[PDB]
Write a protein that binds this ligand. Structure first.
Ligand SMILES: [Cl-]
Ligand SMILES: [Cl-]
Lengths: 271, 271
């Protein structure tokens, strides 16, 4: 039925079809987001607007990279957040030709949902670069959290944020425990398993980025993700170490509860 | 159902879906050819092989240009003819980003038919450039054929060609009358109406190119089409004036029987 239209079907929960560009090895991906299909979308509200979390675009870009064979998100810069309008949103990712180094540009567009794709009013929401896979470090066997780390009490964490206009519903309240040492933050982050097929579940990935609120940073929204590497897919329960990385940024190291490396982010920048 | 997969449906008889690349204004088109659906494919046999006529790729490229908004085929260079293998063939056309002049590259690939598009063994069959539309000349009101033109008898034209290994079945025997003056050739060319939705019906367009066999050229296969402009779609009956255009090439001017301009080709080159 997908082959009947001459496209490939996409396994990612948010994607519908993929089409290769045979001459340059790129590809175009189409998908659709809506609160009906992904009710957790309704639980990320910022200043009164239902905003799609940037982590949705990061996970989709990782899925695109894995499909095209360039699985590292060397950079993704988020423009305007997607504002979810009851009607849902169409998504379109384009991966272009390789540069001399073998890297490719990826662009991400969205539009208000329409019946006929010719009518889609695309706007650009992100752009970045896909690159080659890198090896995983060794399993972490050190005490968790580290010896001198002290508990960060989380009791009114989400209440506090809500006051400030950042309203995370239970689906996004995924910081389960946290500790601090110097300006490093250690956290256990987990969601309930649901859809398979994400590269890194975007609710889980947003909650990984939430660790930045617990450090010297916490008093914006992430806007640039730099060197995102994925070593395991399908995680719903991870440990995160967030370390300072220059102004308005932290590096992230994400493992499973057994210490195996799951993902790294050289710097996540807020603005 | 097409919108369900996030693509646009294609009106061209050989195409299945189209997908825009919103960032650069290009697009990717997929389709499929087979003798079951287009029985005339079986009637173009060259040296014993069932070869898809180059005019199929030219018509598809014009359809792509019209869709993207660049309706002139500034050039199309045909590589290896597509050899039709009982299983049919998949087709894929990619239109890229505009150059500074606003022109775009178009690539055409084909593969043996497969159930899963991920398995498609694409090979490149043509590449060219799409450009901006140009105005039509005035209606031709001159005597047809011109006053001093003499009949070219056509009686064993197709028999002769068949001897030489070029076997055109009745569907392609579309040269209905021809005349010559100097090295110019005038011809009436027509097929029976069938599928709508072609930019220039590829059987009709191959028979337009057949006029090159009637002139000082006629004793190969066209391999480069230079500046193909379309002023009318849906023609099944045309008049053709073919004029010498340098070595191994002729220019073509194609009108309806009322003299209105339908198409021009600055040079069609054989090799
Ligand atoms: Cl494909
Ligand atoms: Cl589209």
């Amino acid at each position: 039925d997908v082959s009947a239209l001459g496209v490939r079907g996409a396994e990612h929960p948010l994607l519908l079809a993929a089409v290769d560009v045979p001459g340059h090895g790129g590809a175009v991906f189409t998908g659709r987001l809506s609160t009906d299909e992904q009710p957790w979308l309704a639980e990320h509200v910022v200043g009164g607007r239902t905003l799609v979390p940037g982590s949705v675009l990061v996970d989709l870009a990782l899925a695109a990279g894995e499909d095209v064979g360039l699985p590292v998100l060397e950079e993704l810069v988020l423009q305007r957040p997607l504002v979810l309008a009851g009607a849902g949103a169409l998504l379109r990712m384009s991966v272009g030709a390789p540069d001399e180094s073998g890297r490719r540009t990826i662009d991400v567009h969205a539009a208000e949902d329409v019946a006929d794709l010719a009518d889609a009013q695309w706007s650009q929401h992100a752009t970045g670069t896909l690159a080659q896979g890198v090896a995983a470090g060794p399993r972490d066997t050190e005490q968790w959290p580290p010896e001198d780390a002290v508990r960060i009490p989380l009791d009114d964490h989400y209440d506090g944020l809500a006051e400030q206009g950042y309203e995370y519903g239970p689906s996004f309240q995924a910081l389960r425990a946290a500790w601090r040492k110097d300006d490093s933050v250690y956290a256990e982050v987990s969601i309930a398993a649901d859809e398979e097929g994400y590269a890194f579940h975007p609710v889980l990935l947003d909650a990984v980025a939430q660790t930045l609120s617990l450090g010297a940073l916490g008093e914006k929204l992430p806007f640039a993700w730099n060197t995102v590497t994925l070593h395991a897919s399908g995680a719903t329960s991870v440990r995160v170490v967030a370390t300072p990385a220059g102004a308005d940024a932290m590096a992230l190291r994400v493992t499973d509860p057994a210490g195996h490396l799951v993902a790294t982010v050289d710097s996540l920048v807020v603005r």
